Write a sequence for this structure.
């Protein structure tokens, strides 16, 4: 398996996929807007009640939503 | 290990699924009822004050990982011997042992 | 199969980074989406040049005229009106129902 | 049909425990009797709060867990930190290639050091006595409140030989109204006669302090 | 089991019958379902070893192949004293699995 | 009177020290001594809530006793 690679570890590949999705989506979120918690979750720092969201995919989908946009323009 | 040294082996806490020739099942008697874990603690585990203290290989002087072993895994594999007593369990005249 | 919310978010960001000729790189980011489905989702619905507003009076008149002209040919018609062919199609059916009353 | 808080408070043997809602109880006499019994711990305070327990904005910024000291003495944290800092640099090719050609003896701490961490250097942590229930703000409101007549070393800022500078004026302005029973030297406390401190000396001479039954 | 809230124990007055466990259930505790540290032998009530049922599994009901024990923790908490620990109803999970396979197969 | 306003301080002085300073007189139940975030330093004025009136009445007098870093401190009702 050294000379030509054999097989693939689909669980670790899925871990890598989660990292690459995270890096991609994170580069479009400015550093003030998102606060990363101790366990790897994310809070929205715009919205006054700080909702906490499990992934960066959910944080991006939240930042699309109308509650966030209304809370955004006040800040 | 060789066949006489296998009473010196430690056992896994959960029972083996292949029941025959097991050492840790109820029927074998190696998993006993009403075990007090404090009394059987130092059995087949490292005890620096007790009888099984942290040993090193007699050949390469690097630390073994099994209690009561005098030879580290690599040296025992290469010479063909039991890791505890050093009796040979394998005839290695025709085997170019590869550590890789 | 169907497009979740978070998948659309990933797809928009990934097109913004990698552009529109690398759908195999974009498919690697999503779960169980192929490259062709990513492309189709982008042009159908997620592209910013798609206009999701209400129909003007002019745009409707061109729709009714061109649908008389070339019947059932919505890919030919659709760039002349500047809506998606699916959008053009459902709005045509809306107006036909409306004229039935 | 039901008590108001004043009748209930007089009817208790101890009226400091009664709250607004205890009158709404189906048996309020027994409830306030049980709240004033010794060594019982009160109902967790968030039973009436609308927000869920521990789901609060201050809890967002909690820092990571810190290891104890006897574990950081092993050097586990520096080794494993370096290890996972290399493993983010590797590609999937390289990781799947060292999974067929492994690398022995990498992250090994000698057994004697690990045994000593657990069987020699272990220290008991700070523990809490019974009835000290956790609530949500607790670890920030743990500063408490130090009484007059007891000074901190730092309050060094005064730099005065040992009485208080303010007292030279408390005798002038009077004893403060807020404290009815406070006692300070020179006003109503001996610097009469001063035999109070001699009592503590004589008693302290009297005591044997040898704990019975300890290890030799 | 502890994993199924709708299962129900017999809990009658246990007798001299020894409860047994099928190959699938071998080595686990009847109450808390653990694999470690077996402390006491399980006794089942008379009705539960009536007739053909004599010697079936306590936990599932299959052909029993070894004796059932309580673990040490269930002994210390005296969970071994509540009654016959035979499970008397199949429950939703077992039934659903059957109809699902039968639909497919 | 339960609260007092305290002026004219040096940032080395701290809220915990301040609590011990005024509890020398009588206990400060609620302490407030602003931390300014922008330049990370204190302007030196304080607000103190007590148990009841007792702490407040003493408050003004407590000011005379106070002397931080060779300087006085304003205490008045609020
Ligand atoms: Zn938001
Ligand atoms: Zn060796
Ligand atoms: Zn041997
Ligand atoms: Zn079974
Ligand atoms: Zn158990
Ligand atoms: Zn029964």
């Amino acid at each position: 398996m050294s000379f030509k690679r054999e097989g693939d570890d689909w669980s670790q590949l899925n871990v890598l996929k989660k990292r690459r999705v995270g890096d991609l989506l994170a580069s479009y979120i400015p550093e003030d807007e998102a606060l990363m918690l101790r366990d790897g979750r994310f809070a929205c720092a715009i919205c006054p009640h700080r909702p906490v969201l499990d992934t960066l995919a959910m944080l991006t989908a939240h930042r699309a939503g109308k509650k966030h946009l209304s809370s955004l323009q006040l800040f | 290990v060789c066949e006489k040294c296998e009473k010196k082996l430690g056992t896994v806490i959960t029972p083996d699924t292949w029941k025959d020739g097991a050492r840790n099942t109820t029927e074998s008697g190696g998993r006993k009822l009403n075990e007090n874990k404090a009394l059987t603690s130092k059995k087949a585990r490292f005890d620096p004050y007790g009888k099984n203290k942290f040993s090193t290989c007699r050949i390469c002087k690097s630390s073994v990982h099994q209690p009561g072993s005098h030879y580290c895994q690599g040296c025992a594999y290469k010479k063909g011997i039991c890791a505890m007593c050093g009796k040979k369990v394998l005839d290695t005249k025709n085997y170019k042992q590869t550590s890789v | 199969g169907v497009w979740r919310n978070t998948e659309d978010e990933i797809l928009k960001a990934a097109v913004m980074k990698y552009g529109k000729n690398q759908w195999s790189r974009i498919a690697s980011l999503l779960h169980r989406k192929s490259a062709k489905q990513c492309k189709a989702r982008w042009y159908e619905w997620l592209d910013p040049s798609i206009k999701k507003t209400e129909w003007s009076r002019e745009e409707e008149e061109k729709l009714l005229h061109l649908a008389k002209l070339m019947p059932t040919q919505w890919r030919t018609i659709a760039p002349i009106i500047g809506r998606t062919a699916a959008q053009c199609l459902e709005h045509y059916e809306f107006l036909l129902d409306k004229a039935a009353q | 049909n039901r008590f108001t808080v004043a009748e209930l408070k007089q009817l208790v043997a101890r009226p400091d425990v009664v709250e607004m809602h205890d009158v709404t109880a189906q048996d309020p006499k027994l409830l306030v009797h049980l709240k004033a019994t010794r060594n019982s711990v009160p109902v967790p305070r968030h039973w009436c709060f609308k927000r869920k327990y521990l789901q609060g904005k201050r809890g967002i910024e909690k820092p990571p867990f810190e290891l104890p000291d006897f574990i950081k003495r092993t050097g586990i944290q520096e080794m494993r930190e370096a290890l996972q800092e290399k493993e983010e640099q590797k590609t999937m090719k390289s990781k799947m290639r060292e999974k067929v050609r492994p690398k022995m003896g990498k992250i090994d701490i000698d057994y004697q050091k690990l045994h000593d961490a657990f069987f020699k250097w272990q220290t008991k942590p700070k523990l809490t006595i019974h009835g000290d229930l956790y609530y949500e703000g607790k670890e920030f409101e743990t500063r408490l409140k130090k009484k007059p007549g007891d000074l901190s070393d730092e309050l060094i800022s005064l730099g005065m030989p040992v009485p208080p500078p303010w007292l030279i004026a408390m005798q002038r302005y009077g004893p403060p109204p807020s404290y009815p029973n406070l006692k300070i030297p020179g006003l109503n406390s001996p610097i009469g006669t001063n035999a109070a401190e001699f009592q503590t000396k004589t008693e302290e001479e009297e005591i044997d302090r040898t704990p019975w039954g300890e290890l030799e | 089991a502890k994993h199924h809230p709708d299962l129900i124990f017999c809990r009658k007055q246990a007798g001299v019958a020894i409860g047994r466990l099928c190959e699938k259930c071998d080595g686990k505790c009847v109450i808390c379902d653990s694999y470690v540290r077996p402390c006491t032998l399980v006794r089942i009530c008379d009705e539960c070893n009536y007739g053909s049922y004599q010697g079936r599994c306590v936990i599932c009901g299959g052909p029993g192949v070894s004796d059932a024990y309580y673990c040490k923790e269930c002994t210390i908490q005296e969970k071994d004293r509540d009654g016959c620990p035979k499970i008397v109803n199949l429950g939703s999970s077992k039934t659903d699995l059957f109809y699902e396979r039968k639909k497919y197969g | 009177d339960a609260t007092v306003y305290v002026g004219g301080l040096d940032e080395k002085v701290s809220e915990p020290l301040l609590w011990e300073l005024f509890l020398q007189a009588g206990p400060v139940v609620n302490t407030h001594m602003p931390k300014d975030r922008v330049t990370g330093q204190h302007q030196g004025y304080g607000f103190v809530e007590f148990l009841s009136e007792e702490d407040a009445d003493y408050a003004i007098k407590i000011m005379n006793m106070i002397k931080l870093y060779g300087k006085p401190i304003r205490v008045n009702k609020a």
